[PDB]
Design a protein around this nucleic acid. Sequence first.
RNA 1: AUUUUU
RNA 2: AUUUUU
RNA 3: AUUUUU
RNA 4: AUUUUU
RNA 5: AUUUUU
Lengths: 66, 257, 95, 192, 60, 202, 239, 37, 37
Amino acid sequence: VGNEIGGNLLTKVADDASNILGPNCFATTAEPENKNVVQATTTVNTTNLTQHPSAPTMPFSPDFSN
Amino acid sequence: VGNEIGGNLLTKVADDASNILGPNCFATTAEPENKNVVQATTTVNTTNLTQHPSAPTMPFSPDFSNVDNFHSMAYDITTGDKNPSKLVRLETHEWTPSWARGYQITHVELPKVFWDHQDKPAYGQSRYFAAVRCGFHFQVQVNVNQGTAGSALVVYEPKPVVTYDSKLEFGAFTNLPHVLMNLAETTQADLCIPYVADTNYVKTDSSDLGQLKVYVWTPLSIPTGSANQVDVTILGSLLQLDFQNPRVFAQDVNIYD
Amino acid sequence: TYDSKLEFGAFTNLPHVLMNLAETTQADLCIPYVADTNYVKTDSSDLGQLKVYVWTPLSIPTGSANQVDVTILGSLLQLDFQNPRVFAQDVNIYD
Amino acid sequence: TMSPNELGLTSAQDDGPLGQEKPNYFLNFRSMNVDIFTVSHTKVDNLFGRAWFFMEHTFTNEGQWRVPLEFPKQGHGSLSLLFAYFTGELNIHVLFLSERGFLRVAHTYDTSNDRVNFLSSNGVITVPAGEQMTLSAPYYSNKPLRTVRDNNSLGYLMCKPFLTGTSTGKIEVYLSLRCPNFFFPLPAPKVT
Amino acid sequence: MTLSAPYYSNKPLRTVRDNNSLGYLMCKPFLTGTSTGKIEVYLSLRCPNFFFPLPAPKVT
Amino acid sequence: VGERAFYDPRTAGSKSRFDDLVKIAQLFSVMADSTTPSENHGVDAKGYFKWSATTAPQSIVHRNIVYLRLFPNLNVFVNSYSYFRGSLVLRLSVYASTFNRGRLRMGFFPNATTDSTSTLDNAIYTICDIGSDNSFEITIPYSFSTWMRKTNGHPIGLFQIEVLNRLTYNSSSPSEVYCIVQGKMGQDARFFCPTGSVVTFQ
Amino acid sequence: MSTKYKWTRTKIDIAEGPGSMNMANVLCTTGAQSVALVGERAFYDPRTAGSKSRFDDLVKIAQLFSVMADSTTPSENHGVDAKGYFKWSATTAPQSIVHRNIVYLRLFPNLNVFVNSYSYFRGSLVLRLSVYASTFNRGRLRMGFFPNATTDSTSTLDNAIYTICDIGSDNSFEITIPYSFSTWMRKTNGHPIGLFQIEVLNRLTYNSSSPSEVYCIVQGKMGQDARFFCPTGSVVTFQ
Amino acid sequence: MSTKYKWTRTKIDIAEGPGSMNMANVLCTTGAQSVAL
Amino acid sequence: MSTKYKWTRTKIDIAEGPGSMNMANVLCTTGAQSVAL
RNA sequence: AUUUUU
RNA sequence: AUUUUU
RNA sequence: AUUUUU
RNA sequence: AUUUUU
RNA sequence: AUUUUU
């Protein structure tokens, strides 16, 4: 109904007013990488609750077989 | 699991306690118009990042074709685009009689000559780019009455030649794209020169990429009564043009190492 | 032209964006060629002009900053230069 | 079902593009369209198809009457002020109040005051004394669109009465338009 | 002339008796010289819809 | 030759002409718009007033009798058509910060004439809870003793916006905000007879 | 091809009368110009009137009963007047008259309106006498009618169109008068309808707890074959 | 479509005699207007 | 049905000349009125 | 509203 | 009531 | 009596 | 003589 | 330009 249409109301308009040189503008809308989510982690008899999680990291092509 | 169920936990309850008069309450839940999103817009070499976008607006039943169906301007739609490649007068010097063979009539700084003055169609764009890669189409014109005779050497000299010009033997310049044009026979010479350099791109506003010259093959043999003011003109067109590197307005930028 | 003759609060009839601060940081407006003539003289104020008014004045708390900047960016969905002319010389396309 | 957006909860900054026929409801209510007449009185063609007074001129000699026709800020025609551009047929209603004579009437969008000195091909219709005619002037404008506000938004009207004796009188003029093309609605006008 | 005015009333029905049962008529003459005169007016109706007949009127 | 011309919408940036005027009557416009907010606690016609923390949980932030002429767009039709019908939509837009919170109930008593504060429990009301979308609306179904009512005659009704819950704030947020009231016609709106003019525009 | 003649507009002769306005023929008025924005029509609403349809024929109104020469007080002349409101009394002899008068259409509220509108008419007329007595009162009353009669004088009704009324539960007797004139259509306001007389046949009987005299009402309407024809000027002004 | 011409009412030429009343030809009198309801 | 419009008589525009009598074209004279019974 | 006429 | 005309 | 016009 | 209009 | 009317 609005507040996200920023991508196809700019991507199309140009696609409608484009010449042989193609569109002079492209617009894409989506959700931020930092979304409103909650993460929970449980180890032996423990539970970690985080409401502001971040993308977990790890070394290059790692081997956790240990 | 909760925090949104506000719609079917109120819409149903009534639908469960409704009489012949129907439900006495309706509840609907959903996401706000202003959601948590991010918008990105890219124009020529630009990118606008907004994390608090709003619904884009526009006039009623708008037409963005932007093309005048009546053609109040009868020209090709791509006129402005191709304009800079347009043919232009690059030079016009006077063939001063009594000039021995080999003598240089006139030269022309290639390719910076196409932006010779602010009145050159290509001068506009040339100022917003530091790199250039283009092809040329020259048309050296020399008119002389039938009574008179003579011949001039219209030849293209890349930077290599221009650099070591004195080290080269005249009369061999016929090895370069040229046009020995015999006056009283031809009034114009045509030369199609592609991009020639030892570098992929040439710095805009530079004498690189060589330069076109006009020499005296055989001096003018002007009879007594015949006129004695022969003018040599050099016209230039861009077979293909390409401006890449962006830069401040007419600021010397070094594309070379 | 006739700006003073128009009632503010009705300007919402024109392509606009009532943008509520603290909610939106940018507004988007796609405007096609609008004029009573097929073409507009280059270097002219014709074809109108974009403006930014004060819907409701800024309510800046005590500690909060007080220097809000308004910026206007522009892109050409489609451009078309036709009439040739000397360098930047005023030419009349109109009658 | 019905969303909260259609129940009143919305955001003013999410109205673009212009022209959103969004439905508004609540229990015990729904948009009910009931017609009283066989047709609409809101349609541009119908409303404007009805004339409205413009101005009056009192002549004494055989002089000519040149007047910049414009949209009214007075009658029901004022509804035009809500638009910016116009184009289409123009109906001119002229009343020739005279005892004995003829009234030459013409219309042009041409601004030049000399192309009218003659009336060669500017539409010289003839209304005999004490008569009245309704001429429909075509869009013979040199401009694709007519800013609706201009003191000459509509083309100029010419009236050169051909009197016979000392007779004098007055020419009342009112007007309407045939099928009007309005574009890009602008903000509502103010009051005096 | 004989002009037929439509039922442009804001009331679905017109009490037939009212001093204004029928809508108001306007006449603004556009005269030219000292000329004067008189405007006689008579009227009828096109297809009339009458409802709920009431008792007969009295005489003066 | 009694012919016709080929119109050019493109120059106007449009793909088609405008055929119906009702659509314009369906465009929001501020009610009795002013440069300064209501200096009488909103008891005037100004559709531009202030929502203040001080205002009691029942005090009034704005009250007035509504007429079509109080709206720029509509006032034009008022000076053109004699009658009309259909629902009217009013949209209150409160411009507060992301920290401000509170509720406000705006009701409407159709065809009411006594300009006096009164409980809205029986009136058509809408409770406004401040959040992200701070522009609440309210629809008023056609209500008259006739199938068509005067465009300029009897009031539309009593419009009142009372405080439900004091506007809350904090150290870095405003203790009072600005509000705007717009008005337009419903999708079932209609106008009927064109009449003379009661005012002159400019 | 018809190129042997220079094309021209049609030529026509204009009949007598330049702007003659016919305000007599309906076929003329209904075709008049319309000041309507688009010359259209409106949707009528009968419901607000509590009706399911409009009223198309006026004759039906002429067929609605109305009191004859109605008055506040009963006939003070033993009914020898036009008052359609008189008294039936026990005293009145078994042949005396309780009411006599010459009947005209104008003597009836509803009809008098048509009398002031139309010039002629035809059809039968119905008069309904309603005697309001108690359940104990008994007796008979003969009401006759001599069509087009003019001499207002009591006379034997043996040869007149009469109706004998025997008091019971339905105390509202009628009497029909078939169209009777030398023409196929008669003046709505001219020659009398006839002589109307209501004579006593059997004295109104009563008892200790019942009235010795009762009230009577005479109504009049048009028959199912009633018709009116030419509309004429007015002879009176209503209010 | 015939939209190349602005629609207009029919135009006709009126023959001699404005309100000439022919009281000789029966075909003329029988066609006279009716004052009938 | 065409009951969306109030029925009315045809409207027509009268060309130049009110009672102009053409005494040049035969096609005009032969069509003149007849005083015949 | 064959609420112009058949 | 081809009581406009065939 | 295409003695309106084809 | 689609040199009224299609 | 069913941007006269269906």
